[model samples]
Target: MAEQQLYINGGYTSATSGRTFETINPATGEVLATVQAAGREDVDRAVESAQRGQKIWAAMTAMERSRILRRAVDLLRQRNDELARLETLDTGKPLSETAAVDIVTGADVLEYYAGLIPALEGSQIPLRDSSFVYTRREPLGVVAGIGAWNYPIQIALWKSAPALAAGNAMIFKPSEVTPLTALKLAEIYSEAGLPDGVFNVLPGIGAETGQYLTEHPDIAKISFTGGVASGKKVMANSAASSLKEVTMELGGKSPLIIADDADLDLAADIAMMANFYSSGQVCTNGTRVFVPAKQKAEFEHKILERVARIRPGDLFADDTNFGPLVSFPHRDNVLRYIESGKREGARLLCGGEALKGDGFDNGSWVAPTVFTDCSDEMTIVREEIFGPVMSILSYADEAEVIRRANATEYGLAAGVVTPNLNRAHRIIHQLEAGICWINSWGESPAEMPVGGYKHSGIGRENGVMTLQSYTQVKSIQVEMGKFQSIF
Candidate 1:
């Protein structure tokens, strides 16, 4: 098998230690390829290269940067299917979804930033007589993006597109479990007129490269997407070093509220899609679903009927709705959570087992599982079990449900599905999540900003906010009477 190397200084090179690690196809537990494992020295090389590139990149006109990003969008579209297949092979997400949703989202985000680059100017302030004051948004030098494995390609672009658009060189450390697409993207950007060292992909274990990148003195800013515990560590490390700025898109136990007046069929469909999409690996998945006490039985019936038909099959299969988890350990983790839910007295409304035997024996497979009679205090209800598991809780009124929804330490995303316009709006306004949906769940555009409230994350991504996060604001004050001095 060919060994994948780190992309540094616009070229593919092996790690300093000459060591490598295997990246398995989680769908079948097969060794797909071996990627070069980077160390502190490798990270340093990338950082130094990024510094060199950022200077030249930052000096360019915004229109020039915008055109380059647009070229990347065109190239990504040209190789859409190829990149999507690689994403599925690495991430265990279905090919169809990766092709249609993941790749599309990445391309659209690039296009969005491409257009916004030229328009990302700072403010001109009106000052008292004879003095002019204005703000300039400036690039923060080399930036680091430590990505999660769930949406490898999408997350890589989500962080990289904006940082690069703002004239900052980037070092991407995609999850070790899934790094193929990121490597491909680095190559694509190079071909699309991006200068060497401006965009680099370092494929290595997080324990090694991730820690080094966060604490590096030269890395001016960090944009990370991962678990909350990891996010905290990144922030603390950033604080200790150069005090680099950080934008964290961390974990979430987002709640989806279903009111008594909601359209039962529409609500049920939305709930199942929200909870099970990407096999529940999404950080914003509505795993904690709140249903009205009066509609619990009907809602449960509809959810069960829909979830039962979900078949966890091969990603390449046309009939598959759900695919394997990212790794064997992750599969076991999900199964343990399922067991915990049952032992904790939550009724297992549907699936609650690890699928073994036949074609499923090799892969990391977990059935689409749902539970009812769940209480807020239960282990499954509180923690983030990143798998195809759903927990349903019954509530008597809106006030009670809203309180329960906001009780978790996470507040990344939430949704309200109700026919009552006023009720949906009220709940939407009150939801603690940074990204909330009214009468829908998980529907967003490239222009929509994404982040969370409370412990979910710090700062934001997408839209114009993400572009701003990659920049630093500097105020320039001009004195009309230049010769005036204090004597």
Candidate 2:
């Protein structure tokens, strides 16, 4: 088996403590690689190296930084297949999905941020004619990104691209479960001419190494992607330490509303894609699906017809559309949620059990589950399962549906499928979410901003807003005539 070491200061090395952990292949229950587990000593060294790199990287002009980032984008494209295969092995996602979505979208984000280098500017404030006042956006010295495991490579790029484009040095801590592609990305950055220590990767447990990054006084900012409880700890750690800036993309139990006038076929397709993509490990998945009471049976029929075609098999197989969960514990957790739905009186539409026997004995497999007659107070309706489970609810009118949808603590994303333009606009406007989709679902372009409104997250992740988040502004005021003082 291969040993994946930590990438620090442009070189790969073992942890000072010499501790290691095994990263498993979720599809086969076999050890894929032995990765060095980072400790406090390793994190300190990476932070120090990042401090050195920040000066070197921030000293370069914006155009120079853009060139290096663009080169990294090219290298990512050149090794797309290799990266995609590693991602599939690490996360147990289908190879076709990883190749088409993970690698391609990650590269697109980097390229988009590279093009926005010149747009990283501050505006001028018109105070008076006698004085000139303008702002300059400056990079934070050294920052950290703690990512979730579902879209390992994509989350790494999503957090790093904007931070690097804004001229900040970054230390990335990918999830211990899927750390392969991130280590490879460190090599790609080095080959693309990123300076030593400018980009580093440390893979370890969240409570130890991830907490170290959050509480480190040297790190100016920390961007975290995970559950709500972990995000709270990250914020509290920052407060107890240096009070660093935090941008959190916590998980959500978003709602997908199917209006009465919606196209039944299109809504059914969107419903399937909303909750089943990536085995429903997505943070912004619309898990609480609301349909009209009159059309409830019709919508369930359409959903059942489509659910029968989904097959969970080998991750590398060309015909496999669905794959195993990331781990056995996670599979069991999802099964618990399914059982909770059953006990809470929600009718199990189809597939409320795990796949066993045959080829699935060794892997962590859960069938795509659907629950109807769900209520707002049900455990499955209120919580973020982070798995392939969908709960269908019935609503009488637009007002009731909107009221119930906005009742959740999370406001990450919501979708509406309706032919009436007026109804779509009204419902979307009233929806309590950061990203709202109309007549479609789950299309996140690089140019648009993505974040939550309430507890789902703290700050935005994509677009020019993300570039601004990695930087701070300084105002420069110059007296045109002479120095004046208050008398």
Candidate 3:
């Protein structure tokens, strides 16, 4: 809707590379604006500025820090609607989800960390002789908040909040496709009283500027939310340079298992929202829906009903149910997988074509899709299609469901749709996912524990654990009793 600018240091600056690209509205494929691109130099400048800002920010006491964080939370709440629109327009998601889910969760994440500031209290332990051992948490100084094209603002805040609360400064690298909202956040954060370099945003490509941010020796921490391979690369970079602390929430298959006794009605609804939310561009979007073998056909029909209702309209329209993929490449990639699934003999239950539209020629868009009788070995079921694509796999038993769910390298998020509370409880604990929901899908809280298991990546992004990741603890020992003679 408006020209975009990158936020760096204490001010808004365009890319020094003189490079710019248009960020299109996925719903109508409208070119929203020519957004500036940050190159390696811009990332270097941001990190350098963050290093300086952290020294000043970290020097303040906990109470002062808490006030700053609370102010930021307030600012985000006030501007939530505006930012939500920018996000929906740029990313092509339902306005309700962006305005309610993403914005509220982001604000709560900031508020949660704000309250935890006082809990930065040190831990004391008994020691030998006249010695008492205590540990104090220290900030990591500088961090890079790397985001993906999907859920930019929410994930950016998730990475930024704890680091700033723990007294560290951050350089936020927003995804190129969906950066308007993140850039707009700079004004809110700055107005909220955050020091200039304490928090800044750099909107650019991950291949160029983002990689530099991860590999930079000046950055003491790397907090990223993206697909699986990028997380791996960030890990390798962190290990190679400075052994920096890293908190990465990588992708997930996020299986949804509908047990034998499960309510098909609830399953149908949850399955629809689970896989289609964000147009299935989310990392933890449900890709595998396991239904009882005997009832697979009927359950599949229920899911197809919701899938048929996906309205490919204007991104800003309240009537639209689904949005476009980030770009042409993303659109093609997702469409290719759908073709592959069909060719591989998987039953195409519903939707396998781009929604017809004249106003959508400039960007990406895909229809909600589902495939039944999908085998566990099929690439569509095993890999993250990351679009409005889902596979309904048949399960004869609960044990089979669990096996299929845990079969993937990803274990970030999962869902269970069942009226049988007993069976839900039995399987929830046994499932190998970081965040598991019973009778619901896409349920996340700002203060709730969310992370990855296995190759889903390490560490978490909620509760006091977020603050813990941005800090290092050093044990101090003092004699509480008489000094020991032995060296």
Deviation from native of the Cα of residue 72 in model 2, angstroms: 0.9
Backbone clash tally (model 3)? 7
| Candidate 1: residue 199 Cα off by (Å) | 0.2
Candidate 1 minimal-lDDT segment of 10 residues:
477-486
- List runs of model 1 lying over 4 Å from the truth: 482-487
lDDT of 3 at 160: 85
lDDT of 2 by residue, 1-487 (tens): 5788889999998887577888899989999998888899999999999989888988888889899999999999999988999999999999979989997999899999998998788878777888878999999889999999999999999999999999899999999989899998999998998989999999998888898898888999999999987898898898789989999999898999999988899999999999999999999899999999999999999999999989778778887889899998999999999999999999999999989888788989998999999999999999999999999999999899999999999999999999997998989999999999998888889999999888899999988899998999999987787886899
In candidate 2, how many Å is residue 273 off?
0.2
Q: What TM-score does each of the candidates earn? A: 0.98, 0.98, 0.95
lDDT of each: 0.90, 0.92, 0.83
Winner by lDDT: 2
Clashing pairs for model 3 are: 130-479, 130-480, 130-481, 131-478, 131-479, 131-480, 132-478
Residue 360 displacement (Å), model 1: 0.5
TM-score (C-alpha) between model 1 and the true structure: 0.98
What would you estimate as the lDDT of candidate 2? 0.92
lDDT of 3 by residue, 38-61 (tens): 887888888888888899888888
Q: What is the lDDT of residue 375 in candidate 2?
A: 95
